[PDB]
Design an enzyme around this catalytic site. Sequence first.
Site, short mmCIF file in Angstrom:
data_model
loop_
_atom_site.label_atom_id
_atom_site.label_comp_id
_atom_site.label_asym_id
_atom_site.label_seq_id
_atom_site.Cartn_x
_atom_site.Cartn_y
_atom_site.Cartn_z
N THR A 1 -2.87 10.49 -6.47
CA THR A 1 -2.26 9.30 -7.29
C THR A 1 -0.83 9.78 -7.80
OG1 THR A 1 -4.35 8.74 -8.11
CG2 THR A 1 -2.44 8.35 -9.76
N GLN A 2 0.14 8.54 -7.79
CA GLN A 2 1.56 8.93 -8.26
C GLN A 2 1.85 7.31 -8.92
OE1 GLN A 2 0.60 7.82 -5.22
NE2 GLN A 2 1.69 8.62 -3.63
#
Lengths: 250, 244, 233, 212, 222, 231, 240, 235
Positions: free
Chosen positions: C1-2
């Site tokens: 996740t970013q």
Amino acid sequence: MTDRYSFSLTTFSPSGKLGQIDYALTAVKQGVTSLGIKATNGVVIATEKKSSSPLAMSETLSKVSLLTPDIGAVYSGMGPDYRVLVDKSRKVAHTSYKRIYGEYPPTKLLVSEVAKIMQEATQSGGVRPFGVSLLIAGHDEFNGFSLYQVDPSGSYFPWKATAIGKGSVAAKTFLEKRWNDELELEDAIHIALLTLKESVEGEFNGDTIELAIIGDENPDLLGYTGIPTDKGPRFRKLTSQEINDRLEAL
Amino acid sequence: GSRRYDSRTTIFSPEGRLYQVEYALESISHAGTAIGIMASDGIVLAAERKVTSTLLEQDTSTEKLYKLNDKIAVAVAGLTADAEILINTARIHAQNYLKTYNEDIPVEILVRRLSDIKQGYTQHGGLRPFGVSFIYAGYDDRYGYQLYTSNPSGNYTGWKAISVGANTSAAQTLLQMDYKDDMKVDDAIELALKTLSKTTDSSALTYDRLEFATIRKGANDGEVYQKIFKPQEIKDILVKTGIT
Amino acid sequence: TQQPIVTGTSVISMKYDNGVIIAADNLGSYGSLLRFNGVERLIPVGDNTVVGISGDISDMQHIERLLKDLVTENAYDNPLADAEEALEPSYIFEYLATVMYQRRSKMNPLWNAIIVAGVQSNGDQFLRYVNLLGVTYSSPTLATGFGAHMANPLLRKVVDRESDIPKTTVQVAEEAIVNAMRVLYYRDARSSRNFSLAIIDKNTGLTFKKNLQVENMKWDFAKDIKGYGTQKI
Amino acid sequence: TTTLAFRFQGGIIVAVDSRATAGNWVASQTVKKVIEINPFLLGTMAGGAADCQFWETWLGSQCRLHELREKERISVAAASKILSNLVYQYKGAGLSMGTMICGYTRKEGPTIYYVDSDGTRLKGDIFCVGSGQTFAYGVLDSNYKWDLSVEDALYLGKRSILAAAHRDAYSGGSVNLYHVTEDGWIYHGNHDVGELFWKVKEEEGSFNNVIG
Amino acid sequence: QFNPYGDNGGTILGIAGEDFAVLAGDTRNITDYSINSRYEPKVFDCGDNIVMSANGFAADGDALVKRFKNSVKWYHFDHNDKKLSINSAARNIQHLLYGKRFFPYYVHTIIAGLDEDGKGAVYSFDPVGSYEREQCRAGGAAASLIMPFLDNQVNFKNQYEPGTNGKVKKPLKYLSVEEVIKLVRDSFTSATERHIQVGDGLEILIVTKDGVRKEFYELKRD
Amino acid sequence: NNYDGDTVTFSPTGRLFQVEYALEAIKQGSVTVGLRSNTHAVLVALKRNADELSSYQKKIIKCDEHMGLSLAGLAPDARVLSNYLRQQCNYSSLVFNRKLAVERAGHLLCDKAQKNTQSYGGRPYGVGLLIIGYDKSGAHLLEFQPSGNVTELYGTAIGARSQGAKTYLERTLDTFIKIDGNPDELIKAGVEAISQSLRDESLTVDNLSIAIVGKDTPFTIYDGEAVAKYI
Amino acid sequence: GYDRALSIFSPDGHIFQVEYALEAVKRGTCAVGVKGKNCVVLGCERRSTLKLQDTRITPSKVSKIDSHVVLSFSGLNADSRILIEKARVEAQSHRLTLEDPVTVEYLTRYVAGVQQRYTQSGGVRPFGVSTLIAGFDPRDDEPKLYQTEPSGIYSSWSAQTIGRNSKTVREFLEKNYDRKEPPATVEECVKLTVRSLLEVVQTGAKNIEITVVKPDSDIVALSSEEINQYVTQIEQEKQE
Amino acid sequence: DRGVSTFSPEGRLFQVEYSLEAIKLGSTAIGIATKEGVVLGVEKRATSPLLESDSIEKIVEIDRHIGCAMSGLTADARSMIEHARTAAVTHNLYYDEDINVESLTQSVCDLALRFGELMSRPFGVALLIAGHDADDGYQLFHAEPSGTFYRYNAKAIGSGSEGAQAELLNEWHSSLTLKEAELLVLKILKQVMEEKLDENNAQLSCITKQDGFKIYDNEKTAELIKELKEKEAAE
Ligand SMILES: [Mg+2]
């Protein structure tokens, strides 16, 4: 690739001999003579700096090594095997003792750790034994001064005085006649120099002889002042000049 | 590849013997003799150091008798370095048991554990076996005083009196002759020293060539004391028993 | 996740009688800051495929390097690398779609929306979409981001269903695309005036047009607009 | 959901409803909440539909392997424990199960084990699981005897599900009956609750609150 | 925070006849209030006279169908080109779905075909792999709009025979393939009127002993 | 002699004996023929039985709709290599939506076999393979040896007495390459080719095995009464 | 890890390491098993080359695997401890998961499986041990007696012997044991077991061990004096 | 010494060829396939009269529709049977159906060549796998330690195999009944066995579509032995 030698290379023969250990001892026998003598107020260890070439700077090759501030070592046999054992011995003194108890190990226990490493090379897979015998001299608060011999098998014995390598048989006889329980450190150094002269062929001086002592605390070698309980290392390597001074009173 | 150089340490002979175990036992037969004798009021451990020197520091030396815990001790016959590996393992096992159950480890349980470790080296791993035979002297509240022996095969057995190392055949015959069941510690001390004196390959038996230890309930009231004899104390017991 | 940092906006495209057209502006935004003004977001693969990318620019550059490596790898031990065994648009898309879905399945997506435009060996038009979730779909017109909301309605007036494709010339198609890019410049706050346009035709091949500008803009009527209600001056 | 199972003289009765819901939406009226593990063992479905289906047909495979290796029918105790030990390994991961493992062997007799996704494994005579479990317990507790006939026991199980189906919004559709004997289970049909309700109301005189 | 799931809308319908089976679905693909495609096929021929659709999150749907098609291929390799029966396919799909029990395929799956007696068959799955054989099953967005209608017009629920007044049920007479298609078309036409995600087109796959046939019908595009 | 104990040892003349011994297993195996035109590719294989009660060992394996092989030597090794080909064909289709080229399939088989000839502990594969296929560049025939050597050919034969069929194909080269759009005549040529390798025994209905792939023809295997037409 | 294949086939189709493991069993002290109508008896030889032994603490030849099953052996003593430990662990594991103690056949099948595994696993040698496993299944009164060997094969026996001079005592048992009428009582079964060992043992003093196992976890080891009474009665009948 | 996976100059694996010699020393096992079923029979060969012969288990069930007989080092067969049973049950779990006899045999034969320096040596046992499925009917397979399996109408393995196979060559035809096959196995077992054949030193079994795999009682086999004796004395 992968190390596929997971089996022992040292095994018992029909007669009960461990061949590789015996052959390692034979390599030690060919090695240059080294000795150790224990006094009432110190210990001395000594050997010959057998230079391979006169162009070689023999000061850069250290046969006598500091393991801890109060423990030193000398050898007879294969030099490279000794060098790596000194590296391992220095590290194990920290990892298995100083980082736990906040102090350096006593002589007998550091010897015990070195012995364990040498025993494992006698049983582990895909390795040969170390081709050296060590003489380890040291001091600690509760045991006082001590001197130990360690062999390729991993066996170790405490000595009042002894010799290993080329002319050990003759040297041990010489030490038996001279050793007593009332020796001062200077007397032991004198006897060490007398004993070592017999096994040396060529030049005999401070530049061809390596000698160290375990004696009094050296606050001048500590590197700092301000902590009363820290009084400095008991290990000290004698200089070329200091050896020559004692060769005139020989 | 590597197969060429493998000795195959864990195989049977055509007769059904383990080559390496047999050869390790041959090695042990040249080691200094160790004797254990069990009495009603204690146990004796006596052992001969191998051809020593006058320059050996005896009072700080230990090659035969080792403490495993406060209740159990061992006499060694064989490679000293191999024995110290096993001894440290046994000391840890005793402490593991004490931490788990809050009770001192029974003697046989400790002996079985070490013997099982030796067995493993004869069945798998392709490594050489440990060239060591032990005499275990110990006490617990179930069986009281106990003597055991183990050898490189990993087999162990219990004894009233036993010897390992050199001249065990001669030593065992002498023990079998003079041992009795109602014997006491002071009598067992004398038997152990007399047996070593006759079986030794040396010219005479002196204090500097011996290690000695007793496990007694001769500790103030219901408890057990281990006594590793000092050089001067071995010299005194040699004069007392009339050997020197 | 970013989170996406440096981003590219809409990519738009459509089919016509003999091929496909694709377009995208040359901006790399840093939030509301229009930071980088010379970013090429259309990346050709061979002479039969153009991959258009929106979303995170760092991930775009990674995808660009994967496509470059794909061409190298295809040429290895391949005597027909420039003929029968050349990379097809359908091969390039399926590879990207595999990567996008695998990356979303490890909870570490390539934060992009991608449109692969090209012409197959048999002359058939290829146009298909894939995004950070691994979702795929095809249509006579395709667009990402704001383009989906504003370009598609205009492009669908030209080609509304499959049967409208043979009736649509390259001139009519390009005209519609260029107009859509103007509309996006009027109404998307993260768009720029400068853009690139690519045509892939089964007869004339790949035509790649750089440094295009939005022109013929209507702004004059702004002078008559005063206040927000009652103000006369 | 409403599922029950009880021990009696003639073996075990297993009775279940047929409804599955997603919120207020009725997804199915024809769900199978009795898993036929093998010809001798039955399991009920409550909580997670997939979790119950998947792991109880898996249980059947393990039971089949057991009797191949041991040349003997698996006990209900051993069969239930294989399932409970399995779900206990997954504890915390989010499995949802509430099931009755039912069987009849020589050494044990008729046996029921309630098995739960949080690891619980209970032997018992009467078990009732689901959103309508409290309604079914009422009819069971007040009418249960060990010396019930097979005919009367089958009806009691049918009537208890009907009680739940009427009051519990998330239970209904149809009733599935089973009778477990030592020689295996016997299926006793599918019974639509709509038709069953009116039939029972008239014949029994119950449900006077409802106009018919 | 990254959300690995999405919703592509769509609605599917499976009906099992006496010697046939249909699996229908709309061709519209969406996100939120936008149309991605007006024609994106959702029902697939998987070989061995089996048709399949995995409705919901299209990425997971495409992944599952692709893996099942693959499972059919390897079933042939491993078991001497044996035909994969509809019941065996159903059990296999359960294991595919439950394999991702703790990170599920966000889809509602339906397969259709003929059983080993030649009778029509439909199977229905939840996201994590629980499955049932069924006669009639709608899935997806407008499932709640379609199923009550099918209960009434296929199974004749709440319908009784005139004159008896509730005493005699309307008999469950068998429906032809033409009759079923009429009900499918009327189901989707009604769903299109009242559900925003349903429209554009209707594709039906019919399965008989002769093989798999396709039919397409236009739907309202607003 | 002293250099054949394992695959990791060269002989003084630079030979690998374990690989050569693996090659010997192929020569003991039953004969199989491969040949192609521009439109189709054909495999013909003589199956071998244990005795009269036994079945005839299968020789041909399908790898994809457009590719397959015939084996000669250790059958389990052919199963391992054909399984690997099935996976590689499949990886190409799933990831790249692309049918695997026959030439590239040969390169993959070469590399897999090579790793077993340079490492200690392992052994070479004891089987030879004839791969046929139809891809984007037309019909193809490959010959695989467990040394790693893969060769593209118009026709060939491997197994016992394979030299007779190989000479026949070498004569007929100009004729059978021209058999385009006629599957039956191409198989006839293959059946006539494998007949040059028979002694004492002849081609019966459960003895013969034929496979074909082409322009509009998926890889299909013919056994039993399906090959009576060609006897 | 050490992976060397020690157990392998020879040109004549023999696995010599497994066969040499049997030669170790031949060297071991004799063990014998006899099942009566309602009991099983395990007899064992103690070599009298070792006196000054402490018999209280010395490992006994018969070992309880559970309260209802026992195991004796011939061969390497250290090897047998590893099989006994594994068997004891498996017995408790069976009780924990199946909620029922092991059958004698199951326990035998497990131990035999372990022995087999050590004949085709890399880096290990076979067990130089053959075992006799005896007892009664839970809630069953039928006597059970099984045998295992280094190869891993196992089978049930009415009466069997293993170890040194086992050929002689098997000869005795084959002519003295009747299947139609097995030793009806504990006395008769113990007597026949002691008789069979007296063919081989030497002195009937501390050289013979006897263990009786009855149904419902009733296991007891006979003492020196109790066995000595059997030894006395046998020879007094023989003087005739 | 030399590798375990070494090839001989003739192109054969030494260890596989040597394991085949161990199988020749094993007790005889025979299988006969008919259109009414497949029959399996074995020689028990007890080493001593005190050995309870009914504990000798050389015929084994894999599933309801598949049985198996063994010859050679029978201890090695236990893990093969375990794998076969697991494969049969696992396939039923995945596919809600019975597994094909050939597919089961192939799964067992995949274990065979998994040896090297995986297990340390090949299996020293041969298997006769018999069963029924809907696609190919009644089948009999011979699984070897080489990894190869042949289908057979009839087959014998073990010490008396080549003599028995020659006898099966003459006696087998495509119209054999189940009863005729039972007697034929007994007849050939009696011919090659050292000791005299009876119900205690030999065992019969069969697999039919209706009843599945069944090991015959000693009382049932005893009657078939008596039926055999009378029909041989009839001419
Ligand atoms: Mg709508």
